[PDB]
Amino acid sequence: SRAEDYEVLYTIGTGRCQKIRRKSDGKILVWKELDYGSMTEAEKQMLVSEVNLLRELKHPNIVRYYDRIIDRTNTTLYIVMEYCEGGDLASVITKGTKERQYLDEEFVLRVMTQLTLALKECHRRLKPANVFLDGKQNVKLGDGTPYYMSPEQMNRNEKSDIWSLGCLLYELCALMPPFTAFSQKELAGKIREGKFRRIPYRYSDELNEIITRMLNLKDYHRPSVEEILENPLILEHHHHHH
Numbered sequence: 001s002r003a004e005d006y007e008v009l010y011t012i013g014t015g016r017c018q019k020i021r022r023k024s025d026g027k028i029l030v031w032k033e034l035d036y037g038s039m040t041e042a043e044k045q046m047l048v049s050e051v052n053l054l055r056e057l058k059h060p061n062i063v064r065y066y067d068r069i070i071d072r073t074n075t076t077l078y079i080v081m082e083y084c085e086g087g088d089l090a091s092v093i094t095k096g097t098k099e100r101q102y103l104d105e106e107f108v109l110r111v112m113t114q115l116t117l118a119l120k121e122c123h124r125r126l127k128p129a130n131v132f133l134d135g136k137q138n139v140k141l142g143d144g145t146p147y148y149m150s151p152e153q154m155n156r157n158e159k160s161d162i163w164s165l166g167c168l169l170y171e172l173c174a175l176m177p178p179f180t181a182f183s184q185k186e187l188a189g190k191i192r193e194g195k196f197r198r199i200p201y202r203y204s205d206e207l208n209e210i211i212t213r214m215l216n217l218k219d220y221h222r223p224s225v226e227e228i229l230e231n232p233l234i235l236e237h238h239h240h241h242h
């Protein structure tokens with residue numbers, strides 16, 4: 001449980017994230033590096049409590065945080081977590097834009113099912129760059145214009161998460177967010193009228209309908225996590241598999 005127990009293989013992104021290999025058994029992992037050296041004791045107490053709660057989240061659709069390593073020599077904190085070889089959803093969406101190719105409805109149903117179960121777990125106790133893919137088609141929740149801001153949270157709620165999920169699934173389908181604008185104020189205007197284009201016609205009316213419900217202006221009209229999973233679109237094979 002010290003940094004020397006792992007070899008860095010290479011940097012994923014820049015704190016900073018790195019793909020690492022545990023020496024004892026060759027297990028591929030990643031860590032996130034936080035420099036606390038510029039933090040106060042109150043800020044560091046916050047950081048430790050937060051990290052300790054992250055350690056508790058054990059769920060197949062949430063990024064698993066295994067360990068925390070302190071290198072007081074560097075004043076660097078390392079959060080060691082599972083490696084998701086598939087990258088994040090943001091890159092999937094970008095790939096699709098680039099290669100002019102829409103994502104499979106089956107893939108979208110997998111994201112919808114597994115992300116909804118992730119939220120369900122969070123509520124029991126959201127953007128593409130915060131959604132990760134493993135090697136076996138599993139989706140995991142981890143960790144500028146606020147494209148996904150819900151109407152209500154734009155004024156002063158578990159139904160706000162549903163809205164944000166709706167925006168994410170929408171953008172997975174259309175390869176663009178449901179409400180776009182050049183300024184934030186234009187954005188807010190668009191979000192308030194609550195109008196948007198149908199996802200592309202290659203997607204079934206049933207898929208269109210549930211994404212559209214999640215994007216209702218009134219939070220009480222949005223489906224709950226439980227109503228979402230009850231939908232006939234959502235089958236066993238859309239769930240996680242080891």
Ligand SMILES: COc1cc(-c2cnc(N)c(-c3ccc(C(=O)O)cc3)c2)cc(OC)c1OC
Nearest residue numbers: 012017030063082083084085086087088142143
């Ligand atoms: C395909 O390469 C990429 C991998 C990742 C990536 C892989 N595993 C991870 N655990 C993470 C990751 C998950 C959560 C957090 C957090 O909670 O702060 C941090 C990292 C990421 C990511 C990529 O792009 C962002 C990759 O593409 C090069």
Ligand SMILES: [Cl-]
Nearest residue numbers: 097100101102
């Ligand atoms: Cl296209």
Ligand SMILES: [Cl-]
Nearest residue numbers: 103104105202
């Ligand atoms: Cl399809």
Ligand SMILES: [Cl-]
Nearest residue numbers: 197198199200
């Ligand atoms: Cl269209």
